[PDB]
Amino acid sequence: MAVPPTYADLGKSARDVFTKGYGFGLIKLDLKTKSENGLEFTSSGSANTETTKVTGSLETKYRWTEYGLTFTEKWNTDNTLGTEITVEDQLARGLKLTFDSSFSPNTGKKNAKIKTGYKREHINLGCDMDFDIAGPSIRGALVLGYEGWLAGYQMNFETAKSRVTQSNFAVGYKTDEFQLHTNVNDGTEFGGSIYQKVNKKLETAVNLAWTAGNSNTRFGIAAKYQIDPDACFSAKVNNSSLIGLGYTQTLKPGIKLTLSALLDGKNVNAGGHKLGLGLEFQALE
Numbered sequence: 223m224a225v226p227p228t229y230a231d232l233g234k235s236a237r238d239v240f241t242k243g244y245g246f247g248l249i250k251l252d253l254k255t256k257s258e259n260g261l262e263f264t265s266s267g268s269a270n271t272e273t274t275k276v277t278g279s280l281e282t283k284y285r286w287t288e289y290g291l292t293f294t295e296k297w298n299t300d301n302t303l304g305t306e307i308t309v310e311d312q313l314a315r316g317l318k319l320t321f322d323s324s325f326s327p328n329t330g331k332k333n334a335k336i337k338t339g340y341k342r343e344h345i346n347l348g349c350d351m352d353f354d355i356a357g358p359s360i361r362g363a364l365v366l367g368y369e370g371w372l373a374g375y376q377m378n379f380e381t382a383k384s385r386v387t388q389s390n391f392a393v394g395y396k397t398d399e400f401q402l403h404t405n406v407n408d409g410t411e412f413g414g415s416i417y418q419k420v421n422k423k424l425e426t427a428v429n430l431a432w433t434a435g436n437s438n439t440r441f442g443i444a445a446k447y448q449i450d451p452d453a454c455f456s457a458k459v460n461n462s463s464l465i466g467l468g469y470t471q472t473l474k475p476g477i478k479l480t481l482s483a484l485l486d487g488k489n490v491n492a493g494g495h496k497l498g499l500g501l502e503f504q505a506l507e
């Protein structure tokens with residue numbers, strides 16, 4: 223109702239299609255369920271059939287009061303276990319406090335991190351600080367919002383030293399029927415994305431990145447085509463003459479099936495084709 227998502231509108235649609243599902247021939251699974259009772263069940267994990275590579279994770283979240291109290295816990299059965307709590311200032315509207323803590327199984331290593339930021343209807347900025355044992359690091363992320371213009375800046379300051387450890391920048395541009403999302407990884411990595419939707423049922427997306435220092439440029443094109451039902455067919459391609467295809471269609475009333483396939487014409491004929499399966503969605507009534 224107040225202070226809409228600006229950081230998420232930096233390039234979610236672009237990165238969503240740009241991040242080609244890693245087709246390792248395995249099966250992914252993800253189900254999220256939230257209710258107005260403070261109880262939130264979040265399950266995320268993957269399983270490899272071709273090879274013995276299956277790992278599942280369980281995350282417990284809580285949702286109390288619309289925009290009041292939120293808790294996020296991430297515990298892995300095989301991986302590391304950790305939890306986090308988020309509280310929204312009642313009197314100090316806009317003040318958001320999130321405290322997370324990581325813990326290793328049968329290790330004793332405990333990591334504490336505190337995140338404090340403020341969200342304004344005009345702009346949303348937040349500062350996070352991760353406390354480590356070998357060297358604590360700070361992660362700051364500030365997003366600016368403008369009528370039609372969007373901006374986002376996120377970088378981490380190197381506590382162990384007197385300088386920044388990592389710098390990330392991203393620009394968001396919203397237009398009538400045009401959407402442009404740019405993003406650069408530090409002063410050494412710079413890239414951009416351009417999404418154009420056609421009048422008809424044809425969506426177009428573009429994403430490319432360039433590594434400063436060398437003349438190596440990488441670009442990719444991905445489009446989406448809706449058939450009619452709950453099944454949509456998407457296509458993608460890499461500058462390396464790579465043929466990509468992703469089919470997203472819902473199966474059951476709560477879970478969606480996502481298919482991905484990558485064919486590298488570089489040796490796809492004298493080699494093989496890549497396939498990736500993964501189901502993601504939310505469990506509701």
Ligand SMILES: NC(=O)C1=CN([C@@H]2O[C@H](COP(=O)(O)OP(=O)(O)OC[C@H]3O[C@@H](n4cnc5c(N)ncnc54)[C@H](O)[C@@H]3O)[C@@H](O)[C@H]2O)C=CC1
Pocket residue numbers: 233237239240241242405407429431441442443444458459460462464465466484
């Ligand atoms: N159209 C395409 O994208 C195609 C891709 N491919 C293959 O995909 C492979 C690359 O897969 P990736 O490693 O995933 O490229 P990738 O590693 O660049 O995917 C991650 C990218 O997401 C960006 N990003 C933006 N916001 C993010 C966020 N909030 N969280 C995480 N990441 C965020 C990161 O800057 C990063 O560049 C290429 O080798 C190419 O052969 C294949 C065919 C076409």
